[PDB]
Amino acid sequence: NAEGDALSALKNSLADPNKVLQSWDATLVTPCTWFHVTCNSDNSVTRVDLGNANLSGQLVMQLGQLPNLQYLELYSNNITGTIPEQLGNLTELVSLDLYLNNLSGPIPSTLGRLKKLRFLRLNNNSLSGEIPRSLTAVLTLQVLDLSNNPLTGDIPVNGSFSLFTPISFANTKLT
Amino acid sequence: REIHQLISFKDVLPDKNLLPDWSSNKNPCTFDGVTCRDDKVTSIDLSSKPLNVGFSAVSSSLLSLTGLESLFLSNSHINGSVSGFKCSASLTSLDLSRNSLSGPVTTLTSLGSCSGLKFLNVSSNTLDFPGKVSGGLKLNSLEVLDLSANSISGANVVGWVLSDGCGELKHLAISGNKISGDVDVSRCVNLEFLDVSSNNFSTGIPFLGDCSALQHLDISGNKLSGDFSRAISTCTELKLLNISSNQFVGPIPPLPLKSLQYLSLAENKFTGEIPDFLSGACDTLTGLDLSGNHFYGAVPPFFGSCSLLESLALSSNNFSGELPMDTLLKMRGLKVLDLSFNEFSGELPESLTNLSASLLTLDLSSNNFSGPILPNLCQNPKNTLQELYLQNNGFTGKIPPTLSNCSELVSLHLSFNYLSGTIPSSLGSLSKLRDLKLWLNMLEGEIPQELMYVKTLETLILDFNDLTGEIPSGLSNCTNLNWISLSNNRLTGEIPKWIGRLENLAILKLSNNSFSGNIPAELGDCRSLIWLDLNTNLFNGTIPAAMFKQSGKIAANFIAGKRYVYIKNDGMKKECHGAGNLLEFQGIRSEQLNRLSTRNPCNITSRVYGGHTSPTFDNNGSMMFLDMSYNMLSGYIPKEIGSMPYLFILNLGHNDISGSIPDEVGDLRGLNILDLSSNKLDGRIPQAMSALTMLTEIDLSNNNLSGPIPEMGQFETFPPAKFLNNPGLCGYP
Ligand SMILES: CC(C)[C@H](C)[C@@H](O)[C@H](O)[C@@H](C)[C@H]1CC[C@H]2[C@@H]3COC(=O)[C@H]4C[C@H](O)[C@H](O)C[C@]4(C)[C@H]3CC[C@]12C
Ligand SMILES: *[C@@H]1O[C@H](CO)[C@@H](O[C@@H]2O[C@H](CO)[C@@H](O)[C@H](O)[C@H]2NC(C)=O)[C@H](O)[C@H]1NC(C)=O
Ligand SMILES: *[C@@H]1O[C@H](CO)[C@@H](O[C@@H]2O[C@H](CO)[C@@H](O)[C@H](O)[C@H]2NC(C)=O)[C@H](O)[C@H]1NC(C)=O
Ligand SMILES: *[C@@H]1O[C@H](CO)[C@@H](O)[C@H](O)[C@H]1NC(C)=O
């Protein structure tokens, strides 16, 4: 399926020194059997939890291909690179945890497309840019902890951000 | 002068203790690995001596030997990367393989300074080809080059190797890399051997050109398809053709038969009936693999003419009709017959008792065969049969004890049949027997104690039978027992406190039985044990601390390679217990798994994990799986339960286990599934349990548990149901 293709592309962009992605099998019908990857009763990916794999590498565009993905935890790795805007093409979603990484560049405005998104931690990275005013859009977000990476540009109160303590900002070069 | 080069080498060994007979007084010729011709040193062979040194060491010292003809360092743990060096025109052969060599592959060009060198084997190392493909290897005085199973990724890298021209190259092997795109050996007119196996070629099907000299073609294990017949038509000179594990479709094409000995078209999209024209290839043809394709009909009778064919494997095709004994007796060449995964039908020919004398391995598994197993099968005094795979068939009635009369039998797999009545006690006499698999049959009674006179018995798989009574104690005489799967029986009694004596026991699965009484602490004595599935049982007691004692010193590499399934517990059915079922599947078919339905309540609406067993560690690992669910097992879960780095799944569910979750439960890093659910556990869920960063599943439900859910970490991703029924619990997340 296209999904296994996607996650494969990730197993390539990534570097797997602790061989967590070893079980990801590219000949397989679906990647439903892979380790740490999981699926629904319909055999589409709902999760990928590689979180804290000591895994290093870049994220990748094909990652947008996992339309039923909900919780994605790439968190607490040595992952470098930018956050691909087709991450927004993952329409279903709950949690996005890129936290505690070396990911570089802008926090993509395309996250304004994930209405179901209930969690965002872009926390603890090194990111460069505005925040979008398009993340004011979403309104679910019972938590956003993006801290520890340099942004500024403002601290929005378009207000969907109404519900957040600043404990959520911590050093953003903010306002 | 020379001698002093040899001690100059000796210095760098860390690790001076190797090469002890190398000493300054003595004449170099008396040295280990040192070979002289008329008292001058033509070759050093250090193979399988842990040199643990740099390549540039070796070359500074040895490669400069005036006159040295060859060097063999294979598996020396030679380190580093291959540089330019002064080298003598007499060194013609270098075996650097089974090593650590690193860099770009372009390093190898430097060897152009070795002017006589016709032989290089660097295989089984780390070389990569990182940027982009051009320049050349520019080693053209080479007759033989083996770059295989290195880290090489690219395209027309095959073009790169042959780039400065190949003319004198007889043998080329690039297998087990990622190389891709185009192969042209067409210029190489001495080329007898081309091995491109296990690569990325999806496109060019090699251009051999004249193919005048080529006897060996291995293009197996690629995404390769396209017209290969037309490609290889130029040879007729060829001894081996391996086109397996590829994308080839269509009817078996005309291919050259004159010297053909081994032919595998296996594992492809090939359809149709095994062609007559194949024919005269019987002059030699010492082995044939048509397995894993789309072929149908029955074994064409001309196959009686290859009395030179040692092994015919037709497995996994549409082949039907009854067992072609008429042909099968005619080939007195035959050693292994693989008929597995087909539509062969009928009862088991009496007329077949002969094979049982000639044959090493009879694989009839996954077909339609019925009636009983010939009691008369093993009646020959002659009988050699090592491997009998009758598993997954329709065989009715008792296991013939007369079967003991096959005295060479190592593997007996009768499983997934309808066999009734008891297990032959008889079987105790099979003195070379290792794997015995009886699981999913109607066998009853007891597990025959005589099985103790088997000193090689490794596997024992009894699952989904009626076998009653305790564990036969005499099994404590089986030193080589590793995988004991007794699950889904009426078995009574305890775990033998001797079970800790089997140094080799790896997978022990006691599920769905009545086994009772305490969990033996001697369980902590077994160096090999990685999978303990005790679920759905009557066990008494408290988890002992000694139970883990061995964790961290563990080596499980013996159990490795055995094929299986895991059926993961849906949980969606009330009745179904455990985390999941680890079943032996070798040669049992995937789609007949529902034949389980009536014995196991669980959904096969489930996701079935599976493949060949591979422990994630070599040495110094831990217990990989523990399910103690559904018992009267109770008390304090010890701190020691944290001592398992490599443990994947922990299911302690539905017990009277009481007290509180030790902080150390955070140190099961490799823990993906944690189920403590449906217990008497109380108190608070330690936030140090945030440390399980790989967890895709938690169930803490049905306890006296109190306090808040520790949000930082994987915990927030888990639906609140899985915390339900802890009245004193502070959280929803
Ligand atoms: C070493 C042997 C004992 C064993 C057969 C082994 O080779 C086998 O391949 C093991 C490691 C696999 C096979 C079945 C696997 C489990 C199948 O059950 C599941 O719940 C999956 C889902 C999820 O992706 C988890 O991260 C892994 C997890 C929980 C797997 C964890 C690892 C296994 C237990
Ligand atoms: C290259 O060397 C490797 C390792 O030294 C050789 O591989 C072993 O060769 C023996 C004899 O063929 C086989 O029984 C094994 O299957 C091989 N082991 C490996 C690495 O798979 C290989 O034969 C050498 N090739 C040449 C051309 O000398
Ligand atoms: C034909 O090619 C196939 C695939 O390249 C060979 O298969 C492998 O054999 C080794 C044993 O040395 C195994 O460890 C691999 O797992 C095998 N792969 C397969 C297909 O399962 C096959 O042996 C080749 N045939 C010959 C005899 O040369
Ligand atoms: C154990 O065996 C009986 C016999 O069918 C079966 O019905 C029951 O469901 C099994 N228990 C489990 C948990 O599978």
Side-chain angles (χ1 to χ4, degrees), chain A residues 32-33 36 43 47 49 51-53 71 75 99 119 121, chain B residues 607-609 672 693-696 712-714 716-718:
Chain A
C32 274
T33 16
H36 326 291
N43 302 306
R47 296 164 58 102
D49 326 12
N52 194 222
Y71 309 40
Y75 78 79
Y99 70 105
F119 283 81
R121 287 203 181 70
Chain B
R607 214 136 72 261
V608 258
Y609 289 100
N672 302 42
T693 93
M694 302 295 182
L695 243 170
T696 92
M712 176 62 175
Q714 289 242 6
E716 309 154 343
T717 46
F718 294 164

PDB file of all heavy atoms in Angstrom, chain A residues 32-33 36 43 47 49 51-53 71 75 99 119 121, chain B residues 607-609 672 693-696 712-714 716-718:
ATOM      1  N   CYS A  32       1.385  -3.082   8.415  1.00  0.00           N
ATOM      2  CA  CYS A  32       0.585  -3.107   9.643  1.00  0.00           C
ATOM      3  C   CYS A  32       1.233  -3.878  10.743  1.00  0.00           C
ATOM      4  O   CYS A  32       0.857  -3.749  11.913  1.00  0.00           O
ATOM      5  CB  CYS A  32      -0.782  -3.694   9.400  1.00  0.00           C
ATOM      6  SG  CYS A  32      -1.859  -2.438   8.837  1.00  0.00           S
ATOM      7  N   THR A  33       2.191  -4.701  10.332  1.00  0.00           N
ATOM      8  CA  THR A  33       2.879  -5.638  11.200  1.00  0.00           C
ATOM      9  C   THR A  33       4.184  -5.092  11.710  1.00  0.00           C
ATOM     10  O   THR A  33       4.879  -5.739  12.502  1.00  0.00           O
ATOM     11  CB  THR A  33       3.195  -6.905  10.446  1.00  0.00           C
ATOM     12  OG1 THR A  33       3.059  -6.639   9.042  1.00  0.00           O
ATOM     13  CG2 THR A  33       2.231  -7.978  10.854  1.00  0.00           C
ATOM     14  N   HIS A  36       6.295  -0.961  16.309  1.00  0.00           N
ATOM     15  CA  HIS A  36       6.007   0.383  16.754  1.00  0.00           C
ATOM     16  C   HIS A  36       4.970   1.052  15.814  1.00  0.00           C
ATOM     17  O   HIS A  36       4.152   1.847  16.293  1.00  0.00           O
ATOM     18  CB  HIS A  36       7.315   1.196  16.903  1.00  0.00           C
ATOM     19  CG  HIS A  36       8.490   0.379  17.367  1.00  0.00           C
ATOM     20  ND1 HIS A  36       8.586  -0.141  18.640  1.00  0.00           N
ATOM     21  CD2 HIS A  36       9.604  -0.031  16.714  1.00  0.00           C
ATOM     22  CE1 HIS A  36       9.719  -0.810  18.762  1.00  0.00           C
ATOM     23  NE2 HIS A  36      10.355  -0.758  17.606  1.00  0.00           N
ATOM     24  N   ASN A  43      -6.892  -1.756   8.520  1.00  0.00           N
ATOM     25  CA  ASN A  43      -5.492  -1.851   8.029  1.00  0.00           C
ATOM     26  C   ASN A  43      -4.958  -0.596   7.330  1.00  0.00           C
ATOM     27  O   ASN A  43      -4.490  -0.656   6.183  1.00  0.00           O
ATOM     28  CB  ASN A  43      -5.244  -3.084   7.147  1.00  0.00           C
ATOM     29  CG  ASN A  43      -5.569  -4.375   7.855  1.00  0.00           C
ATOM     30  OD1 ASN A  43      -5.060  -4.665   8.960  1.00  0.00           O
ATOM     31  ND2 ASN A  43      -6.445  -5.161   7.238  1.00  0.00           N
ATOM     32  N   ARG A  47      -0.729   4.849  13.980  1.00  0.00           N
ATOM     33  CA  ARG A  47       0.315   5.351  14.871  1.00  0.00           C
ATOM     34  C   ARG A  47       1.669   5.086  14.268  1.00  0.00           C
ATOM     35  O   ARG A  47       1.755   4.311  13.334  1.00  0.00           O
ATOM     36  CB  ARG A  47       0.199   4.717  16.256  1.00  0.00           C
ATOM     37  CG  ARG A  47      -1.085   5.093  16.967  1.00  0.00           C
ATOM     38  CD  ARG A  47      -1.358   4.203  18.117  1.00  0.00           C
ATOM     39  NE  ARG A  47      -0.246   4.240  19.054  1.00  0.00           N
ATOM     40  CZ  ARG A  47      -0.252   4.920  20.196  1.00  0.00           C
ATOM     41  NH1 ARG A  47      -1.336   5.616  20.548  1.00  0.00           N
ATOM     42  NH2 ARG A  47       0.819   4.891  20.995  1.00  0.00           N
ATOM     43  N   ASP A  49       5.160   4.882  16.598  1.00  0.00           N
ATOM     44  CA  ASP A  49       5.816   5.458  17.767  1.00  0.00           C
ATOM     45  C   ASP A  49       7.268   5.048  17.789  1.00  0.00           C
ATOM     46  O   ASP A  49       7.643   4.067  18.417  1.00  0.00           O
ATOM     47  CB  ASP A  49       5.148   4.959  19.050  1.00  0.00           C
ATOM     48  CG  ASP A  49       3.627   4.746  18.901  1.00  0.00           C
ATOM     49  OD1 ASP A  49       3.083   4.750  17.766  1.00  0.00           O
ATOM     50  OD2 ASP A  49       2.975   4.548  19.951  1.00  0.00           O
ATOM     51  N   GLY A  51       9.265   7.075  19.094  1.00  0.00           N
ATOM     52  CA  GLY A  51       9.688   8.087  20.037  1.00  0.00           C
ATOM     53  C   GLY A  51      10.765   7.670  21.008  1.00  0.00           C
ATOM     54  O   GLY A  51      10.535   6.777  21.824  1.00  0.00           O
ATOM     55  N   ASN A  52      11.881   8.402  20.965  1.00  0.00           N
ATOM     56  CA  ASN A  52      13.146   8.074  21.628  1.00  0.00           C
ATOM     57  C   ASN A  52      13.776   6.728  21.181  1.00  0.00           C
ATOM     58  O   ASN A  52      13.883   5.752  21.955  1.00  0.00           O
ATOM     59  CB  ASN A  52      12.964   8.139  23.142  1.00  0.00           C
ATOM     60  CG  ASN A  52      14.264   8.146  23.873  1.00  0.00           C
ATOM     61  OD1 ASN A  52      14.413   7.480  24.901  1.00  0.00           O
ATOM     62  ND2 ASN A  52      15.232   8.886  23.344  1.00  0.00           N
ATOM     63  N   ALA A  53      14.155   6.684  19.905  1.00  0.00           N
ATOM     64  CA  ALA A  53      14.810   5.529  19.301  1.00  0.00           C
ATOM     65  C   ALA A  53      16.313   5.706  19.174  1.00  0.00           C
ATOM     66  O   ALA A  53      16.995   4.862  18.586  1.00  0.00           O
ATOM     67  CB  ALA A  53      14.208   5.250  17.954  1.00  0.00           C
ATOM     68  N   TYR A  71      -1.671   9.511  16.179  1.00  0.00           N
ATOM     69  CA  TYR A  71      -0.621   9.911  17.087  1.00  0.00           C
ATOM     70  C   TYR A  71       0.655   9.591  16.331  1.00  0.00           C
ATOM     71  O   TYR A  71       0.770   8.508  15.756  1.00  0.00           O
ATOM     72  CB  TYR A  71      -0.708   9.152  18.404  1.00  0.00           C
ATOM     73  CG  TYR A  71      -2.068   9.202  18.995  1.00  0.00           C
ATOM     74  CD1 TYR A  71      -3.195   9.098  18.193  1.00  0.00           C
ATOM     75  CD2 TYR A  71      -2.254   9.369  20.346  1.00  0.00           C
ATOM     76  CE1 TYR A  71      -4.485   9.156  18.679  1.00  0.00           C
ATOM     77  CE2 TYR A  71      -3.565   9.428  20.896  1.00  0.00           C
ATOM     78  CZ  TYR A  71      -4.696   9.319  20.039  1.00  0.00           C
ATOM     79  OH  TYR A  71      -6.022   9.363  20.493  1.00  0.00           O
ATOM     80  N   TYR A  75       9.316  11.972  18.700  1.00  0.00           N
ATOM     81  CA  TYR A  75       9.894  12.817  19.721  1.00  0.00           C
ATOM     82  C   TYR A  75      11.137  12.302  20.440  1.00  0.00           C
ATOM     83  O   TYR A  75      11.259  11.113  20.662  1.00  0.00           O
ATOM     84  CB  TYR A  75       8.824  13.149  20.737  1.00  0.00           C
ATOM     85  CG  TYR A  75       8.499  12.071  21.724  1.00  0.00           C
ATOM     86  CD1 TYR A  75       9.323  11.829  22.828  1.00  0.00           C
ATOM     87  CD2 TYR A  75       7.328  11.359  21.606  1.00  0.00           C
ATOM     88  CE1 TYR A  75       9.016  10.863  23.756  1.00  0.00           C
ATOM     89  CE2 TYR A  75       6.985  10.387  22.535  1.00  0.00           C
ATOM     90  CZ  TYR A  75       7.832  10.133  23.617  1.00  0.00           C
ATOM     91  OH  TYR A  75       7.488   9.147  24.544  1.00  0.00           O
ATOM     92  N   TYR A  99       8.913  16.937  19.689  1.00  0.00           N
ATOM     93  CA  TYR A  99       9.676  17.559  20.761  1.00  0.00           C
ATOM     94  C   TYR A  99      11.024  16.963  21.100  1.00  0.00           C
ATOM     95  O   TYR A  99      11.234  15.786  20.873  1.00  0.00           O
ATOM     96  CB  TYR A  99       8.836  17.772  22.025  1.00  0.00           C
ATOM     97  CG  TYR A  99       8.430  16.565  22.829  1.00  0.00           C
ATOM     98  CD1 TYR A  99       9.046  16.261  24.044  1.00  0.00           C
ATOM     99  CD2 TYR A  99       7.369  15.769  22.410  1.00  0.00           C
ATOM    100  CE1 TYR A  99       8.625  15.170  24.800  1.00  0.00           C
ATOM    101  CE2 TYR A  99       6.936  14.673  23.156  1.00  0.00           C
ATOM    102  CZ  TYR A  99       7.561  14.375  24.343  1.00  0.00           C
ATOM    103  OH  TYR A  99       7.097  13.281  25.044  1.00  0.00           O
ATOM    104  N   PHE A 119      -3.080  17.735  20.014  1.00  0.00           N
ATOM    105  CA  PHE A 119      -1.778  17.969  20.663  1.00  0.00           C
ATOM    106  C   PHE A 119      -0.661  18.481  19.736  1.00  0.00           C
ATOM    107  O   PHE A 119      -0.457  17.972  18.634  1.00  0.00           O
ATOM    108  CB  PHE A 119      -1.286  16.720  21.357  1.00  0.00           C
ATOM    109  CG  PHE A 119      -1.960  16.454  22.640  1.00  0.00           C
ATOM    110  CD1 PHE A 119      -3.206  15.850  22.674  1.00  0.00           C
ATOM    111  CD2 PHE A 119      -1.338  16.793  23.831  1.00  0.00           C
ATOM    112  CE1 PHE A 119      -3.832  15.602  23.875  1.00  0.00           C
ATOM    113  CE2 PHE A 119      -1.943  16.530  25.037  1.00  0.00           C
ATOM    114  CZ  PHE A 119      -3.197  15.934  25.062  1.00  0.00           C
ATOM    115  N   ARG A 121       3.462  19.358  20.277  1.00  0.00           N
ATOM    116  CA  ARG A 121       4.704  19.744  20.912  1.00  0.00           C
ATOM    117  C   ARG A 121       5.755  19.862  19.871  1.00  0.00           C
ATOM    118  O   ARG A 121       6.331  18.882  19.461  1.00  0.00           O
ATOM    119  CB  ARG A 121       5.152  18.702  21.911  1.00  0.00           C
ATOM    120  CG  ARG A 121       4.342  18.709  23.119  1.00  0.00           C
ATOM    121  CD  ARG A 121       5.130  18.121  24.221  1.00  0.00           C
ATOM    122  NE  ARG A 121       4.336  18.098  25.440  1.00  0.00           N
ATOM    123  CZ  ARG A 121       3.282  17.306  25.661  1.00  0.00           C
ATOM    124  NH1 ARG A 121       2.864  16.426  24.734  1.00  0.00           N
ATOM    125  NH2 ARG A 121       2.639  17.396  26.830  1.00  0.00           N
TER     126      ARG A 121
ATOM    127  N   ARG B 607      -4.793  -9.120  13.591  1.00  0.00           N
ATOM    128  CA  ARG B 607      -3.608  -8.888  12.795  1.00  0.00           C
ATOM    129  C   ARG B 607      -2.660 -10.011  13.198  1.00  0.00           C
ATOM    130  O   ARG B 607      -2.339 -10.154  14.395  1.00  0.00           O
ATOM    131  CB  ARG B 607      -3.009  -7.513  13.114  1.00  0.00           C
ATOM    132  CG  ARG B 607      -2.359  -6.803  11.924  1.00  0.00           C
ATOM    133  CD  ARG B 607      -2.743  -5.334  11.894  1.00  0.00           C
ATOM    134  NE  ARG B 607      -2.054  -4.646  12.982  1.00  0.00           N
ATOM    135  CZ  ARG B 607      -2.594  -4.337  14.167  1.00  0.00           C
ATOM    136  NH1 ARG B 607      -3.866  -4.620  14.424  1.00  0.00           N
ATOM    137  NH2 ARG B 607      -1.859  -3.724  15.099  1.00  0.00           N
ATOM    138  N   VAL B 608      -2.232 -10.812  12.215  1.00  0.00           N
ATOM    139  CA  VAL B 608      -1.306 -11.918  12.490  1.00  0.00           C
ATOM    140  C   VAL B 608       0.109 -11.501  12.133  1.00  0.00           C
ATOM    141  O   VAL B 608       0.439 -11.307  10.953  1.00  0.00           O
ATOM    142  CB  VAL B 608      -1.676 -13.249  11.729  1.00  0.00           C
ATOM    143  CG1 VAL B 608      -2.352 -14.255  12.647  1.00  0.00           C
ATOM    144  CG2 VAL B 608      -2.518 -12.972  10.473  1.00  0.00           C
ATOM    145  N   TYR B 609       0.915 -11.301  13.177  1.00  0.00           N
ATOM    146  CA  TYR B 609       2.340 -11.006  13.061  1.00  0.00           C
ATOM    147  C   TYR B 609       3.009 -12.334  12.719  1.00  0.00           C
ATOM    148  O   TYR B 609       2.414 -13.367  12.930  1.00  0.00           O
ATOM    149  CB  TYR B 609       2.883 -10.392  14.382  1.00  0.00           C
ATOM    150  CG  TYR B 609       2.410  -8.959  14.691  1.00  0.00           C
ATOM    151  CD1 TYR B 609       1.381  -8.700  15.591  1.00  0.00           C
ATOM    152  CD2 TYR B 609       3.023  -7.870  14.095  1.00  0.00           C
ATOM    153  CE1 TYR B 609       0.969  -7.383  15.867  1.00  0.00           C
ATOM    154  CE2 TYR B 609       2.622  -6.570  14.362  1.00  0.00           C
ATOM    155  CZ  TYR B 609       1.601  -6.318  15.241  1.00  0.00           C
ATOM    156  OH  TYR B 609       1.239  -4.991  15.470  1.00  0.00           O
ATOM    157  N   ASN B 672       6.899  -2.478  24.739  1.00  0.00           N
ATOM    158  CA  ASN B 672       5.854  -1.927  23.870  1.00  0.00           C
ATOM    159  C   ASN B 672       4.403  -2.089  24.338  1.00  0.00           C
ATOM    160  O   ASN B 672       3.514  -1.320  23.917  1.00  0.00           O
ATOM    161  CB  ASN B 672       5.998  -2.450  22.447  1.00  0.00           C
ATOM    162  CG  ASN B 672       7.337  -2.123  21.856  1.00  0.00           C
ATOM    163  OD1 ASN B 672       8.368  -2.243  22.531  1.00  0.00           O
ATOM    164  ND2 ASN B 672       7.344  -1.706  20.593  1.00  0.00           N
ATOM    165  N   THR B 693       9.068   4.736  26.202  1.00  0.00           N
ATOM    166  CA  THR B 693       8.931   5.663  25.083  1.00  0.00           C
ATOM    167  C   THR B 693       8.471   4.950  23.805  1.00  0.00           C
ATOM    168  O   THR B 693       8.149   5.614  22.785  1.00  0.00           O
ATOM    169  CB  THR B 693      10.255   6.436  24.846  1.00  0.00           C
ATOM    170  OG1 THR B 693      11.051   5.763  23.869  1.00  0.00           O
ATOM    171  CG2 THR B 693      11.055   6.527  26.124  1.00  0.00           C
ATOM    172  N   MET B 694       8.495   3.601  23.873  1.00  0.00           N
ATOM    173  CA  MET B 694       8.060   2.707  22.777  1.00  0.00           C
ATOM    174  C   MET B 694       6.668   2.076  22.895  1.00  0.00           C
ATOM    175  O   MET B 694       6.178   1.453  21.937  1.00  0.00           O
ATOM    176  CB  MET B 694       9.111   1.619  22.516  1.00  0.00           C
ATOM    177  CG  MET B 694      10.475   2.190  22.168  1.00  0.00           C
ATOM    178  SD  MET B 694      10.456   3.108  20.594  1.00  0.00           S
ATOM    179  CE  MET B 694      12.176   3.575  20.484  1.00  0.00           C
ATOM    180  N   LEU B 695       6.035   2.289  24.049  1.00  0.00           N
ATOM    181  CA  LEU B 695       4.722   1.720  24.378  1.00  0.00           C
ATOM    182  C   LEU B 695       3.599   2.054  23.384  1.00  0.00           C
ATOM    183  O   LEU B 695       3.225   3.227  23.252  1.00  0.00           O
ATOM    184  CB  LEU B 695       4.313   2.303  25.731  1.00  0.00           C
ATOM    185  CG  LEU B 695       4.135   1.371  26.903  1.00  0.00           C
ATOM    186  CD1 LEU B 695       3.971   2.136  28.168  1.00  0.00           C
ATOM    187  CD2 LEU B 695       2.881   0.691  26.558  1.00  0.00           C
ATOM    188  N   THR B 696       3.008   1.056  22.720  1.00  0.00           N
ATOM    189  CA  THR B 696       1.827   1.388  21.932  1.00  0.00           C
ATOM    190  C   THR B 696       0.558   0.960  22.632  1.00  0.00           C
ATOM    191  O   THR B 696      -0.537   1.232  22.152  1.00  0.00           O
ATOM    192  CB  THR B 696       1.867   0.884  20.440  1.00  0.00           C
ATOM    193  OG1 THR B 696       1.255  -0.406  20.323  1.00  0.00           O
ATOM    194  CG2 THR B 696       3.299   0.898  19.855  1.00  0.00           C
ATOM    195  N   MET B 712       3.408  13.583  31.095  1.00  0.00           N
ATOM    196  CA  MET B 712       4.575  13.827  30.256  1.00  0.00           C
ATOM    197  C   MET B 712       5.128  12.471  29.865  1.00  0.00           C
ATOM    198  O   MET B 712       5.444  11.683  30.740  1.00  0.00           O
ATOM    199  CB  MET B 712       5.628  14.628  31.014  1.00  0.00           C
ATOM    200  CG  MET B 712       6.937  14.846  30.254  1.00  0.00           C
ATOM    201  SD  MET B 712       6.690  15.794  28.715  1.00  0.00           S
ATOM    202  CE  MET B 712       8.382  16.021  28.145  1.00  0.00           C
ATOM    203  N   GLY B 713       5.274  12.205  28.564  1.00  0.00           N
ATOM    204  CA  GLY B 713       5.537  10.847  28.095  1.00  0.00           C
ATOM    205  C   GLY B 713       4.354  10.230  27.357  1.00  0.00           C
ATOM    206  O   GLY B 713       3.321  10.880  27.211  1.00  0.00           O
ATOM    207  N   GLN B 714       4.503   8.991  26.878  1.00  0.00           N
ATOM    208  CA  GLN B 714       3.488   8.339  26.015  1.00  0.00           C
ATOM    209  C   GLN B 714       2.044   8.231  26.590  1.00  0.00           C
ATOM    210  O   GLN B 714       1.063   8.032  25.845  1.00  0.00           O
ATOM    211  CB  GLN B 714       3.996   6.967  25.504  1.00  0.00           C
ATOM    212  CG  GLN B 714       5.130   7.081  24.458  1.00  0.00           C
ATOM    213  CD  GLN B 714       4.780   6.508  23.077  1.00  0.00           C
ATOM    214  OE1 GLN B 714       3.645   6.100  22.830  1.00  0.00           O
ATOM    215  NE2 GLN B 714       5.752   6.533  22.157  1.00  0.00           N
ATOM    216  N   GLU B 716      -0.383  10.182  27.510  1.00  0.00           N
ATOM    217  CA  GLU B 716      -1.534  10.990  27.098  1.00  0.00           C
ATOM    218  C   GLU B 716      -2.176  10.464  25.833  1.00  0.00           C
ATOM    219  O   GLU B 716      -3.273  10.890  25.461  1.00  0.00           O
ATOM    220  CB  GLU B 716      -1.145  12.446  26.841  1.00  0.00           C
ATOM    221  CG  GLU B 716      -0.381  13.124  27.929  1.00  0.00           C
ATOM    222  CD  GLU B 716       0.478  14.240  27.372  1.00  0.00           C
ATOM    223  OE1 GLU B 716       0.716  14.260  26.141  1.00  0.00           O
ATOM    224  OE2 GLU B 716       0.937  15.084  28.163  1.00  0.00           O
ATOM    225  N   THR B 717      -1.499   9.528  25.179  1.00  0.00           N
ATOM    226  CA  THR B 717      -1.963   9.051  23.882  1.00  0.00           C
ATOM    227  C   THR B 717      -2.963   7.903  24.012  1.00  0.00           C
ATOM    228  O   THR B 717      -3.517   7.408  23.024  1.00  0.00           O
ATOM    229  CB  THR B 717      -0.772   8.565  23.103  1.00  0.00           C
ATOM    230  OG1 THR B 717       0.020   7.748  23.972  1.00  0.00           O
ATOM    231  CG2 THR B 717       0.076   9.748  22.659  1.00  0.00           C
ATOM    232  N   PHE B 718      -3.180   7.503  25.261  1.00  0.00           N
ATOM    233  CA  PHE B 718      -3.915   6.299  25.615  1.00  0.00           C
ATOM    234  C   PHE B 718      -5.290   6.607  26.100  1.00  0.00           C
ATOM    235  O   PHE B 718      -5.441   7.172  27.177  1.00  0.00           O
ATOM    236  CB  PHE B 718      -3.199   5.591  26.751  1.00  0.00           C
ATOM    237  CG  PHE B 718      -1.858   5.059  26.374  1.00  0.00           C
ATOM    238  CD1 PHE B 718      -0.951   4.677  27.356  1.00  0.00           C
ATOM    239  CD2 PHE B 718      -1.497   4.945  25.039  1.00  0.00           C
ATOM    240  CE1 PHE B 718       0.283   4.193  27.021  1.00  0.00           C
ATOM    241  CE2 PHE B 718      -0.267   4.464  24.690  1.00  0.00           C
ATOM    242  CZ  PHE B 718       0.629   4.084  25.683  1.00  0.00           C
TER     243      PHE B 718
END
